[PDB]
Amino acid sequence: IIPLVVIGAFAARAAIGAALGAGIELG
Amino acid sequence: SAVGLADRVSACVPLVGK
Amino acid sequence: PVNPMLGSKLLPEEVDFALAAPDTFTFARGYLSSNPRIGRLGRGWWLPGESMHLELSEDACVLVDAQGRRIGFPALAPGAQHYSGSEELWLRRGGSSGGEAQAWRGRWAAVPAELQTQEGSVLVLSGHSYLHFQRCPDGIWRLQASFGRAGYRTEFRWSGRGLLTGVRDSAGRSYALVYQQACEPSEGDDGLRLFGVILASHDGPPPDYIDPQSPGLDWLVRYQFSDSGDLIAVRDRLGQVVRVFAWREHMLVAHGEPGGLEVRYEWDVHAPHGRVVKQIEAGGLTRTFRYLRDATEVSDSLGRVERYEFAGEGGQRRWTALVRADGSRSEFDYDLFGRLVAMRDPLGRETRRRRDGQGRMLEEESPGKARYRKRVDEETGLLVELEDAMQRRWTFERDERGNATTVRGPAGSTRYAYEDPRLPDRPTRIVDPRGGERRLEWNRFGLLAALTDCSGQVWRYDYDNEGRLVASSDPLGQLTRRRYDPLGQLIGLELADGSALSYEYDALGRQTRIADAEGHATLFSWGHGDLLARVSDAGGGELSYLHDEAGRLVALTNENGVQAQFRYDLLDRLVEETGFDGRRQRYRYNAADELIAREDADGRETTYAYDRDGRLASIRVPATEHAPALVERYRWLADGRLASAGGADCEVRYTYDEVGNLRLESQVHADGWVYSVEHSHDALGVRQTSRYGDAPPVAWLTYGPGHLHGALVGAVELAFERDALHREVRRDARRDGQDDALFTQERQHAPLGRLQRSRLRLAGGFDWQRGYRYDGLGQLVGIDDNQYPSVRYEYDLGGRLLASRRAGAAASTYRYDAAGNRLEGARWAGNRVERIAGNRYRFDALGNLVERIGADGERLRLAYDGAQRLVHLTRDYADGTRLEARYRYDALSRRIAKVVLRDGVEQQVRFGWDGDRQCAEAFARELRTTVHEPGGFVPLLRLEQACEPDPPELLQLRQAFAAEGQPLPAQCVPALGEARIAFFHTDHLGTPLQLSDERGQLRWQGVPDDWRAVAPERQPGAQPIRFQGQYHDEESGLYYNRYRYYLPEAGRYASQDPLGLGGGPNPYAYALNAPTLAYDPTGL
């Protein structure tokens, strides 16, 4: 997709796997 | 077959709605 | 939900609380209307302790299920066993029939020895959990403990009147249950109801007496009851009500939550045998149920009617067929035990399940005849042998407790050790097939406390009293802390670099805000349930979502206020999609919900075909004005791996080894040119050697789980040094015959893996020191460089690059609209930027760029096929000079050739590929091989070989070996010259900025640029790699990504994203409009 190597706002595993809103809309 | 046969089928499936 | 076969209302188990433990004690409650037993939550509810009931008589044994289903067995003599094939339940009573007592073996070895000789004890084995029922002095069998095969016991404590007063889970916590008189006693009901559960203590014995009215208690859950004893409210760990129920004669007629969900029910008769006749959902669908002799028709508020068909009576009734809203009919077949053995989709494809023995299943057969055998031990009932569709077998060896000590797969054997006395099922030592050994440590909650990898680096984890992760330590000692509210929701995430995230939730537990320490946050608005309604980012942009009664997204509004429409058929399948620019696509499906046709905005229809397993088999791309109709055929292996991808111009064949690793990938072009990439793998499926066509083989030196520490190409050896996090910190290159290293590249990393400093020292004297600066968001806000001018970056609140200020130069300011479209110098509705950088852009009906006119008069025409792939372009310069280029692609949309016609002279360049990475550029008299770093698109080194066209007999030999899927022998290689090796020296993003030869000198140097990735140069063919995965086309000036073409002068792609809305709201945006932070390697 669009990997953000430096930015950890959304590409970081901790920052994206801990978001319930973004982790529940996937399916 | 006759051993451990319930008198009613489980309601797990199918399910409709919420 | 409502079970149309029976007409009853079922509420599946809802976990009120589940504190972490080796065997977590989940306090799950469920409701079934047909259940007539009046429990501690009213009629129809089941709770822990009162879920499963056991009755033993002199003539029969009855095991009442959680749902109240009476499973009948013959008389259970002491020591006897009973198996329920239909229910997969094992019952064994303790004691002996009179003979010599023997220790229980097989599936009964996990029970304690004292329980085996107790005549008044019965063990129930439901799956992997053992239930201990003990007969009490009043003659009622009630659950005493629920232990697994590892011995984690969940004691249940009963008192007088048969009340479950206390529960002690496997982690030592003590739970106290409080009962109060809620209604007057009647027949079959004493009136006592469970008014809540108290976490009495976390360790040690529970207090002897607990006063329910005493303040300061820890109420994990609380319940409210009406005057009739029906459960009307459920309260969370706090005082907040989270569930509300309404009852008519002890029948659930309305359930929901405060806000969010509200469902009402209507019954033909208010009794346990009554059936739901109408299910009204607030803001959703109202369903009406009509019950026939052997079918149930479920009408809908949208007019859809679904028919559920069933056969049999009593407990043997099974759901046999399903006729959907459009008449599609799915059928199910059952064996004599009621287990599912066949399943036919609406197209007629049948999935079989052959069962044998007491394991209930041994083989499943796909419609494409793909068998997944699964052998289970006859005595212990545990998995022993597993075989997939390619006849690859996994063999499990187990110890006395059923723990898989060794797992023997197609690639070596993995060995497990269980050396923790407290937790005999947690592995404390894992040895991979390659031989690397990992060590694990566990705490009293059964959670991972320390992980030591193969290299000896230790990851540590910390938990609170309730088993929630609150601190993580990496091998470098960087802490990642977490904060939780009493409800257990994550409200704070402090990262290793000091950046802290804070989360907010509504009453329903849905996430509503994600904020940083800076202050700017993203807001979430929700509609009904988990249906997102609005997302507002830090920059003020909003994505509004509109849903219909069926919960289907019918409109999407982007930041510019432009709507994208969606339409659906009776099966909730997208049949029409209008984009933000008016591009309308229509879809067609067969009976099995498979996309078989897709009409696009220009009226051209693409038809799809599938094999028996549902995988894509062929795509019939329609003919366009500049390309003929083409058929792309795909063939798959039984396990789902791609075997071939045929097209009109290329035939890609994939060959796999006995393990499934991609061993050979051969690409045979239509004109006979063959390019093959061969790999060798270790026991972990990590590439060890790679041969890219006729280039010299590349040997990868890896340790542990594939961490690269060396590379060998020809006479050149690369060496990598890594830190405790296995991040590269030093890189060397040495050539045989030279004492000194060709270059040394040292790197320093920020706590979150961000590159902080880098220093490159070539042997020729080129010194490149680069220092990186980041802000609180992790955005690169500055680069200190001694070879190139230092640059300072500015970003808006939305994360887009606003300006870049090189030292001693004018700033390059960029302006965007709401949606993220660059504005030269209001908005671009439809996301089609028709004027930027002094150029006029013209798009076709499908959004592809078909015309670019510059200020000087330069004209660039683009032509596409029916797959939206650029197949022909014409470029006219201001000097009245023309240029024509044609491109060829394989079935995977990878550009395999480039034919550029200029002044009547035709030059052809062929490209070889290694998966998604382009690794060859076959010119007329030169083969240029690019080797990328493993597992990424960062170029590592380049190989150049002088070559000549292959003789006709050699081409036939190459095609022969390609057909059989075997690599060409090294003795038949052509007369290629000695390979010249050059090394890529990339920046933080993997964009090559320098190119060094075998003597440490510089061959190519590129000045960094914001959107072009490199300042324009006279000869872009000397080094065509820009960004990651982009190839600079010299003839047109476009950057070829994997799937699309990128406009360097516009900072956007020339065509819409093939993924559509899946890629993002803007189909043309590149790298989130932050080319200094992100990249698109596959162009998606």
Author numbering:
A (entry chain C): 1169 to 1195
B (entry chain A): 30 to 47
C (entry chain B): 48 to 872, 910 to 1168
Provide the publication's sentences verbatim.
In the present study, we have determined the 2.45 Å Cryo-EM structure of Tse5, revealing that it is an Rhs toxin processed into three polypeptide fragments that remain associated with one another via protein-protein interactions. To provide insight into the molecular mechanism of Tse5, we determined its cryo-electron microscopy (cryo-EM) structure to 2.45 Å resolution. The cryo-EM density map was of high quality, allowing the ab initio model building of the structure except for residues 1–29, 873–909 and 1196–1317, as a result of their structural flexibility or disorder. The 126-kDa central fragment forms the hollow shell-like/cocoon structure (Tse5-Shell; residues 48–1168), the 5-kDa N-terminal fragment (Tse5-NT; residues 1–47) anchors to the Tse5-Shell, and the 16-kDa C-terminal fragment (Tse5-CT) corresponds to the pore-forming toxin (residues 1169–1317). Mass spectrometry confirmed this observation and N-terminal sequencing identified N- and C-terminal proteolytic cleavage sites in between amino acid residues Lys47-Pro48 and Leu1168−Ile1169, respectively. One domain consists of a barrel-like structure that is assembled from an anti-parallel β-sheet that spirals anticlockwise along the central axis. The remaining two domains correspond to two plugs that close the barrel’s apertures (N-terminal and C-terminal plugs contain residues 48–124 and 1092–1168, respectively). The C-terminal end of Tse5-NT (residues 30–47) is anchored to the inner cavity of Tse5-Shell by protein-protein interactions and further stabilised by several intra-molecular hydrogen bonds. Tse5-Shell’s cavity volume is ~32,000 Å3, which is similar to RhsA and Rhs1 cavity volumes, and sufficient to accommodate the 16-kDa Tse5-CT (RhsA and Rhs1 cavity volumes are ~32,200 Å3 and ~35,000 Å3, respectively, and both have a ~15-kDa C-terminal toxin fragment). For Tse5-CT (residues 1169–1317), we could only assign the first 27 N-terminal residues (residues 1169–1195) inside the Tse5-Shell cavity.
Combining the structural insights with detailed biophysical and genetic studies, we provide insight into the functional mechanisms of Tse5, a Rearrangement hotspot (Rhs) protein involved in bacterial competition that is secreted by the type VI secretion system (T6SS) of Pseudomonas aeruginosa. The T6SS is a contractile secretion system that assembles inside many Gram-negative bacteria and injects effector proteins upon contacting neighbouring cells, providing a fitness advantage that allows the bacteria to compete for space and resources. Rhs polymorphic toxins contain tyrosine/aspartate repeats (YD-repeats)13 that assemble into a β-sheet that spirals to form a barrel-like/cocoon structure. The data suggest that interfacial Tse5-membrane binding delivers its encapsulated pore-forming toxin fragment to the target bacterial membrane, where it assembles pores that cause cell depolarisation and, ultimately, bacterial death.
